[PDB]
Amino acid sequence: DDISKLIAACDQEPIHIPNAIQPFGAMLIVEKDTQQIVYASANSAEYFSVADNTIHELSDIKQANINSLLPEHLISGLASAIRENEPIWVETDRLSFLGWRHENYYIIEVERYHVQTSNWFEIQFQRAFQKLRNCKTHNDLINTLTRLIQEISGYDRVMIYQFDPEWNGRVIAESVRQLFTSMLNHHFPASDIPAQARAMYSINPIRIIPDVNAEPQPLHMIHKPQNTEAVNLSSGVLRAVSPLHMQYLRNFGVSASTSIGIFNEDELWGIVACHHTKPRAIGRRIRRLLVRTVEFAAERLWLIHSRNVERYMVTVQAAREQLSTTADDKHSSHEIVIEHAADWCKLFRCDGIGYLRGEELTTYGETPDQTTINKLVEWLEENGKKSLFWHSHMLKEDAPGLLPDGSRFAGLLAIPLKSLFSYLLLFRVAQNEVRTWAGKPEKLSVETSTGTMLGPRKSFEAWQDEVSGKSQPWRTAQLYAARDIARDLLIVADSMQLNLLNDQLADANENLEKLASFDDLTGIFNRRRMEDRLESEVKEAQRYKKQFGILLFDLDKFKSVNDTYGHNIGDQILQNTCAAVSETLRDTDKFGRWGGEEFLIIAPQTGMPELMQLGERVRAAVEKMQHKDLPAVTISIGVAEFQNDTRWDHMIDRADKAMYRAKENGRNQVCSQ
Amino acid sequence: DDISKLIAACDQEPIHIPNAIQPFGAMLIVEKDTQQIVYASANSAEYFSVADNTIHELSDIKQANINSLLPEHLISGLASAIRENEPIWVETDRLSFLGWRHENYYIIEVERYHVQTSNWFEIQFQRAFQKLRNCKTHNDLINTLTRLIQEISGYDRVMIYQFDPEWNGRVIAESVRQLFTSMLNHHFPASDIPAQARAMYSINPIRIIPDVNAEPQPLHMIHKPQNTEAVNLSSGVLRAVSPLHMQYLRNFGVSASTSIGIFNEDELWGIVACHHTKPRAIGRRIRRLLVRTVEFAAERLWLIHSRNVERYMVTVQAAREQLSTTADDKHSSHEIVIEHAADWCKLFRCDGIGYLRGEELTTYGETPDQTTINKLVEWLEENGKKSLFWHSHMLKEDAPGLLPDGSRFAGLLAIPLKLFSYLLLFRVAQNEVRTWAGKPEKLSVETSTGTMLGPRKSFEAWQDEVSGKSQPWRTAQLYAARDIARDLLIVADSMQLNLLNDQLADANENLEKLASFDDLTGIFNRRRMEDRLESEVKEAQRYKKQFGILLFDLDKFKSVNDTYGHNIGDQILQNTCAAVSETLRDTDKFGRWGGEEFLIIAPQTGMPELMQLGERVRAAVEKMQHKDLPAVTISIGVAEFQNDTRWDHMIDRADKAMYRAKENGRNQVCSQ
């Protein structure tokens, strides 16, 4: 942690106010209201001697006038400018001026310039934009960017350096001409670019160090300013470089550098870092070119990214359509999970899936055991996180004591499904990412004008470390896809159980209907359904002039059967006779049990002679029916016909008298009266 | 069809091979293999005389060598270049050359050039990128684009002109100065820019007409070429303009124009159109500046577009989540539609919603009546589409006879949910008034290519109206609406599951009631008596316990049923069970054994106490209240546990005794 303190001290050095400049130009600082020159870079006289003859040494600038040192166009522009830190570029024959207003000051930088004329720059823009426009993948864009930046700048090494969410970074593309060792995929620490340093790219996108060993030129006071606090030099390019970073570059083996921040809207997403093994200046026009190219390649990379999102979203919809088309074929949600979880593992970039529904747990791929999965589920409920999803890429740290000791899982995405509980679980094995860093960790202290700080490390040689217990983090697009899949499963599960419950409710109500309208011993209609049916048959026949008749029969000398044989045997006979009678009947007829041992048949659409015929078929059916162990059995049948009757008892009385006459005339008979 | 053929004829005029150029430059056509100049523009003499002292007339070029007219860099570059139609730009002190190889020719255009040294272009490029980068919406971007193109080009009218999928177009942004009338939101017909003209932008993104009245300079032959077919001049900037489009611009009040194609990947999405009231040249560098700026504004606009998909998806997910909050609030889906449909109308930019689930219909906002909605539903099933959704922005054309006559509805998005279940999203037809830059004109014009539509004479505003159409249903809305619909399905499914659970609980509980008790009487049904009796016998057989059974029956009960009715007989059964149950001791079990005969199991009761119990029961039914109903009598048999094996034997004994009581005078107690 002493190194944590050392790194934190890096932020102490006020790099925006070094009171010195790099020597590839000069600088004046003027008061706006006073109109006086208050500061001048120590090499000012070798530049402004072009504007004014008398200026041979620095001390001279005290008696010079600004309106003698600057082109009138730059004075007019500065007098006119209201916005601050918006630099104005005005050039002459031999000097190129860059000036801006900052609070009450006019800061003016001057470089040596000579007019070259060509169409080179416009051709480079056309070629760069054509190539960037043709990039359709992440890797293509960044590599074309590295090629263009290298061809334009001539720097011996160019590399795209992407930041992590913790500010550590990695070289993701690289173009090297000379004998540099390749730094592709090497990781660099946050302390390499302090927050103040990263914040500069937001004020000026390009930083230029044309010579790491160029002695910086301090600013000298010339007329006493009203404020005296060091003037902010951040908007320009001449601002002196921290000696810590110069020694860093020396240790890195770099003589000149140029870096351009890569912005995603207002966020610093990375930098284009360019190195040279010898000093190397870049003119204003090449600076503007590199910056415009990187700004263009940037928005192209954001457009490629946002498009890959839309296209993922399409892929998710295609997967959900795949789910519903297979869903309509009577499968359970567990069956659907088994078929598509391999696709889902690709869709969600996870190593395993587990689905919970009731007592059943379905797993595909790498998963914890059932018991640990329930410890997970329980902890999700007991933690009380009502979040639509719960997710972590370092389970061991975000939820300690949750997993077994040696378990390899680090990522969990859990979607709750309402009730009892249900869940969708997405698992990611920890990826034991071996990281290659550019240099050992070096805890070295360095004494500085601000205090004691971390010094730049001396070795940049490859050093590997390993990260365990972590997975890839769960991207937002995957959270929403997983949520959508989970609910598409809930709809399959809901439809399944709705159908099953409808089956159970129909079966239960059907048993309620069976016990209400049938006879326990025989299974034929009980008397209440016969009585009701007969009453409506009478009403119908009287209203609409239909024809029907009834058969009322009884078992003969049946009590002798019960007493000689038994009640178990007697009931087997009643069941037998009902089975034999039902085979004779037509589907229109209704057959039920009227009393003990007495049965009723309602024969609709039947005239009297055909009725007698049916009574004969019934009487003969019970006669010949196979007795097997039990005794032979006989029925005596009475018959009645609809003769404009008022009430159904009148029919039952007629049929009963006929049936009783059948009993007196020899029991095995059909009788009507 | 009358004017339609004329509009289609415009694609006959071969604008790629006019064999002439605009006079703001000069042109050469050289054979690659021959190395000779085979064609040169009619004003080639006043341009190359800058390069060569000797050239005074056009004919002088015949005796010229290309190594005397062209810069060495341009010849080396053309000899070296493999790809065709990729122009090379080489400038000198007084001439600016642009040349490329095409088939077996090298085409070289030359314009007068003055070295202007300044930092202007770099400053404008920086301002353009800073301002475009600060554009965060579609409207800001396109308007900033028009401001930049006007500052850079100096043209008096700049318009962003976007194409329809049918190639008609509309001005969607504009910066217009003093002499011009405003042209914002005016619609132009497809015939204004034929397919060949749109195709040109894919060959060269910028087109320049610096002077509408500048006489075109033909190409003259100079050396006899090997082929003689007209040479294609598409990749350059000097290609002469169709005379129809010149007269077009004249009618438009335009002296000079410039357009830059706006490309989305490879498809032409619109054009940046610029007009001037005077002649107006643009240097090669302002051309490159305008094209680079438009290419940057292009990708920026596509990024804003792709970002607003993402942001939509976020807003939809948030709406579905808001619906899920109500998911754990025990509300119906019809209540949910009522709470949120005003929000959904914004989410889906529709005027009304109707949700059907079962017999129930919920509507919010503008909807047809229930009757029309059902005619719609019916047509949707009889359509039978396997489609996840069904959608139209013009109902009368896509599904005729379906709405009433005077109906205002034109848009429908229908999500099937499954009886029928549907989510319907309704859009009133927007009676969009379109203002066009000129009436339709059926005007013919005779030309060397044939007769085709001539450019219209008036550009004054003319309005027309489109009825029966709404905004079209974007793909993002189809999927969002489907997801809302399914979020409603989960709410309906849960409700239906709760009600089914309640109904199955009530029905299974009534099955339990009927599993052991008798529906009519409330006494134990016969199965429960059979079971109790079997276990009572086994127990008595293990431990030599004493118990008895009483088997009684109603006397002449068939006569009561037939004399009175089904209702009276059952009331008698309930009375007798009520009277008997009050007689019993708490240990005895009483159940209904047959239709008219009942059973009592009296444990811990010997034969005298059993007989006493049978007598109490017989007296209990006799004293019982006849009320409206007839007087009723029971005859009871009695059996005792006498070292029995099975309950079968016992009920047989009791039955014989009971029938013995019936014959000996019905109101009696008997044992046997």
Ligand SMILES: *C/C=C1/C(=C/c2[nH]c(/C=C3[NH+]=C(/C=C4\NC(=O)C(C=C)=C4C)C(C)=C\3CCC(=O)O)c(CCC(=O)O)c2C)NC(=O)[C@H]1C
């Ligand atoms: C305790 C302070 C530390 C420190 C300070 C520091 N570093 C900078 C500037 C830069 N550092 C950069 C680092 C890299 N250059 C590369 O080529 C790569 C790898 C691809 C990395 C990580 C870069 C790029 C800059 C910007 C300037 C440049 O382009 O070289 C500053 C700010 C200096 C300034 O710009 O005035 C400071 C204060 N660096 C440490 O390592 C510790 C010691």
Ligand SMILES: *C/C=C1/C(=C/c2[nH]c(/C=C3[NH+]=C(/C=C4\NC(=O)C(C=C)=C4C)C(C)=C\3CCC(=O)O)c(CCC(=O)O)c2C)NC(=O)[C@H]1C
């Ligand atoms: C039957 C053939 C027709 C025809 C031919 C034609 N038109 C062009 C060129 C252009 N027309 C344009 C139209 C517009 N400019 C605007 O400012 C607006 C309104 C916003 C419109 C609709 C444009 C832009 C061009 C491109 C040239 C330019 O930039 O001005 C061509 C091609 C010309 C050429 O380049 O050779 C042709 C063949 N136009 C008709 O109206 C009928 C007659």
Ligand SMILES: [Cl-]
């Ligand atoms: Cl600069």
Ligand SMILES: [Cl-]
């Ligand atoms: Cl050009």
